[PDB]
UniProtKB/Swiss-Prot annotation, chain A:
It is an enzyme of class 2 (transferase). Coiled coil: none annotated. GO terms for biological process: alkaloid metabolic process; methylation. It comes from Narcissus aff. pseudonarcissus MK-2014 (Daffodil). GO terms for molecular function: metal ion binding; O-methyltransferase activity; S-adenosylmethionine-dependent methyltransferase activity. S-adenosyl-L-methionine binds at residues 50, 72, 74-75, 80, 98, 127, 152. This is Norbelladine 4'-O-methyltransferase. PROSITE patterns: SAM_OMT_I (PS51682). Highly expressed in bulbs. Detected in leaves and inflorescences. Optimum temperature is 45 degrees Celsius.
Length: 234, 242
């Protein structure tokens, strides 16, 4: 974590974010999500964690659209994955993909105690080959309702070209961190780790592309670090 | 407020935003909102920006989020409480299918008639039943006449800010199980973040205290699941559980 941006907020004060979390998020957070978050807070990459207010937003979307089959790309310790698994019905199904299974094992005991591991097919791999392989075998009747994209930041455009064919018409594709700590707002942004700058430029290009992509409708939402919701049109 | 009482000259929060910079908000609007905004929404927004109550207008990024929720949940029958010039109402009517139906309520029809030419030009006024009235008597009459068959899929609440809690007690019975109730402005320019806050007009302070109480109440209400979203001035989404 030699990164520069980890502690930057997109909201105007730490006090405002704290108010949201303490008033509206933590009281509604499943005990196993609380447990998973607290153990993840001890980890070196805790800054990658999907925050608790964003989690409840993901859950609300899944329930409002009556999602049943989803894909979760970029799992880390499993906060967004457990959010999804708790939101789905008892017979819901999730394909979860991450290059690093050791991160998943940090949160897996909490997923198991929540009683939802049976919904999850965890695949340890880089996401792009898995999505390529899904496209070759995907039957139209098995298209996903919802995809959450939170893996290699520099690769979101490549994920998008597969996902617009893997989610159903009317299904949702959510891209996490599309404001990149607010640093996308300017053509140049000093002081970044070179990997952070790669990600920043990738998101500026992605945001412009998705706003013109005729295959989806979009809504960029200033929650967490920015989330762009895409809905497949055809 | 826009509906009744104090003028805009007294208000203290109008120039605040919940995001960390105006540059970030401008980036969101110019990159992701304006390119996806219907030309009649653009026209309605631009005429409304010149009105004395422009601070109450639902912004363009929030509008596209409302549209996205409506479409993802396949909403068909909705209620819009607090219309003003009609930005969120036109957003809803464009999002709904051709046979969608909206019950729109506002105490001031003259505000609505500012936006009506754009709604007409957009070709979706046929979906809208506009009712000029305070909202509570209308909702109470709906409670007496409603059958389970005709419950609303979605309600957008953006009327008298001091009175959302009373709206909520009706809407949890008027929206179907699994349907959505959205409360607008629940972060009130960030001023909800402290028990005490300096220098607001009495009406702004009454609204601030109302939102602090509402946010605590909704988080404790077993009838709904919630998500408070830091878009616009804060939107709290509620989903009816029973
Ligand atoms: N090419 C790749 N394919 C799949 N996963 C990748 C990847 N590159 C990085 N990742 C994974 O992407 C994750 C980003 S952090 C994901 C956070 C998680 N969604 C949450 O709810 O908190 C890390 O776990 C990392 O191991
Ligand atoms: N008691 C009441 N019943 C119904 N409408 C009310 C009301 N008190 C105030 N209002 C109306 O609530 C509106 C708040 S501003 C609404 C903004 C609008 N939703 C948008 O998309 O921009 C004003 O038009 C005001 O006239
Ligand atoms: Mg992320
Ligand atoms: Mg409002």
């Amino acid at each position: 974590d030699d990164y520069s941006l980890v502690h930057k907020n997109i909201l105007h004060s730490e006090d405002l974010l704290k108010y949201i979390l303490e008033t509206s998020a933590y009281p509604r957070e499943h005990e196993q999500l609380k447990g998973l978050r607290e153990v993840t807070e001890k980890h070196e990459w805790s800054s990658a964690l999907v925050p608790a207010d964003e989690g409840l937003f993901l859950s609300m979307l899944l329930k409002l659209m009556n999602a049943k089959r989803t894909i979760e790309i970029g799992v880390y310790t499993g906060y967004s994955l457990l959010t999804t698994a708790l939101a789905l019905p008892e017979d819901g199904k999730i394909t979860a993909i991450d290059v690093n299974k050791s991160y998943y094992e940090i949160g897996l005991p909490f997923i198991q105690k929540a009683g939802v591991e049976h919904k999850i097919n965890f695949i340890e791999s880089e996401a792009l080959p898995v999505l390529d392989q899904m496209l070759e075998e995907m039957k139209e009747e098995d298209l996903y309702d919802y995809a959450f994209v939170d893996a290699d930041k520099s690769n979101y455009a490549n994920y998008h070209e597969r996902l617009v064919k893997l989610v159903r018409i009317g299904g949702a594709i959510l891209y996490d961190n599309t404001l990149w700590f607010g640093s996308v707002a300017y053509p140049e942004y000093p002081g970044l780790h070179p990997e952070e700058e790669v990600a920043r430029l990738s998101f500026r290009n992605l945001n412009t592309f998705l706003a013109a992509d005729p295959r989806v409708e979009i809504s960029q939402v200033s929650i967490g670090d920015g989330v762009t919701i895409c809905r497949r049109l055809y």
